[PDB]
Design a protein around this ligand. Sequence first.
Ligand code: NAQ
Ligand code: NAQ
Lengths: 254, 254
Amino acid sequence: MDLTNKNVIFVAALGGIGLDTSRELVKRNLKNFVILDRVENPTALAELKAINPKVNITFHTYDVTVPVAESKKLLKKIFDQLKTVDILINGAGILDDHQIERTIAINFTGLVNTTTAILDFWDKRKGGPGGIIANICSVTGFNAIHQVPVYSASKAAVVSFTNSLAKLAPITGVTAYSINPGITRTPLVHTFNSWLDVEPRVAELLLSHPTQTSEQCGQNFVKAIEANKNGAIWKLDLGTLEAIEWTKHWDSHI
Amino acid sequence: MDLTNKNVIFVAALGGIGLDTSRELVKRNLKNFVILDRVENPTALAELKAINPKVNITFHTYDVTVPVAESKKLLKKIFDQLKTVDILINGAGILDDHQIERTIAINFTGLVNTTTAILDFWDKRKGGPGGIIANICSVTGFNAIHQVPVYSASKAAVVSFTNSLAKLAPITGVTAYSINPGITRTPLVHTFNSWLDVEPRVAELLLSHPTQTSEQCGQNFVKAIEANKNGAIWKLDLGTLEAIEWTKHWDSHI
Ligand SMILES: CCC(=O)[C@@H](C)c1cc[n+]([C@@H]2O[C@H](COP(=O)([O-])OP(=O)(O)OC[C@H]3O[C@@H](n4cnc5c(N)ncnc54)[C@H](O)[C@@H]3O)[C@@H](O)[C@H]2O)cc1C(N)=O
Ligand SMILES: CCC(=O)[C@@H](C)c1cc[n+]([C@@H]2O[C@H](COP(=O)([O-])OP(=O)(O)OC[C@H]3O[C@@H](n4cnc5c(N)ncnc54)[C@H](O)[C@@H]3O)[C@@H](O)[C@H]2O)cc1C(N)=O
């Protein structure tokens, strides 16, 4: 993908990884960059507009825990205004294993529902043009942080979901790939709760080992978007970009 | 694990795989077998009670989508009667990718919440005795049936959660392992809904390939329980029992 003149919707663009990815995206001279996030951040919007005044940058309030019909209503209006959308990035996430239901609703159900909603406008069986989805999953979906077992399991679910979307691209017209950061210094990881307080020091201990910056992550995230490889499982860890090979433990044969 | 004179709770014991696993378990001379299921099945219950009349079999209506406080209330009733519980088997699942929220609530959230509740009675940090959890996951949590992406993602989630519970055993005193059937002839897979109807004949297609009986599955399920291997990831496919090796793509270092 050459991002020049493209239209991109980015759910959760203004978080730590989001905003550094967004800084890199607007340098690629998008036509329209539509930010969907829970709370508006006028500082960040001003920063992005200063980086590239040529991009049309818009903001809509969006909480991924709303019902799928509410996501369809919002996406219908964005598609109507823009005519076309090239790429959807699903980035919402929380890390707090004291909040079991909300972790699962935001990190897994919400991503599935935004995806299900945008297929109304993209699915080629409904007359749409197809499209591309980039899901921010996590390396914890391969191998957990077992002190946050619910968070990690929510990310294993969206790694799997994204693998399946890619295999459904011949039917829907919608390709997909996962973006799986390793530990990245953002507000998500500095303080957080472990399940049943199994490890009250989990953030301290985790951040005693090598990390990358959100700037590093964001640079590799835009490289992975430019590679545009349906079914890729991208690892963005310690400043590098690598594709991993999914192990074939079982085959449905269908 | 010697099942002689043990106390076992099985959530979702009277479905296809459950019931054949239940027949095998009550052959092994349990003290108490406690069945927790969303619907009553009077004939299955009566049949089980006849196999080994000396086992004490009790049935409680239980929906895994209730809040954790409600699960704790039910478990308190059971622990007060039995005093000790040796094994919890979490078996609830539905297969219907037209029901996104309820798939995730039953297959993933509900299993996490029953586990979270029973940790109130078992956690060694609170003076509890520890325990053993056997989670019915699925080979689709390794490699999806991509035409039911939400179902398969929910199973990837509980494979992950089970792996992490096992690694938390030194802290909690609760060990865990997953039971992952391949395609097994039950009512679950006879007719079912694919996501966005990507494959309406998904059930017909799936059963055009080698499968196993629920009798074979049940036999291998009780063999896995008797092996009692913390952190095992058991595949129960085509009549065999096989431990799989989890691929190491990333490590948190903690
Ligand atoms: C241990 C953390 C982890 O999994 C590692 C391996 C890594 C991988 C993936 N992630 C994922 O990366 C994405 C961004 O994380 P971050 O580190 O920038 O966190 P941060 O908290 O800064 O950003 C969260 C973003 O999600 C949005 N969000 C939260 N709840 C929402 C809701 N209800 N509706 C809509 N948007 C909502 C926020 O508004 C914000 O845009 C998340 O999906 C997160 O799970 C983070 C890391 C990391 N920071 O190290
Ligand atoms: C494509 C299916 C698949 O994942 C394969 C590879 C295999 C693996 C795991 N499983 C899993 O094995 C377990 C049993 O499946 P089955 O084939 O016996 O299906 P069946 O539908 O006969 O049994 C479902 C059981 O779950 C219980 N249940 C459903 N909703 C509940 C709720 N809200 N609360 C409490 N209990 C509830 C039912 O009452 C019943 O006891 C499920 O976890 C299922 O996901 C089945 C298969 C299979 N039948 O081929």
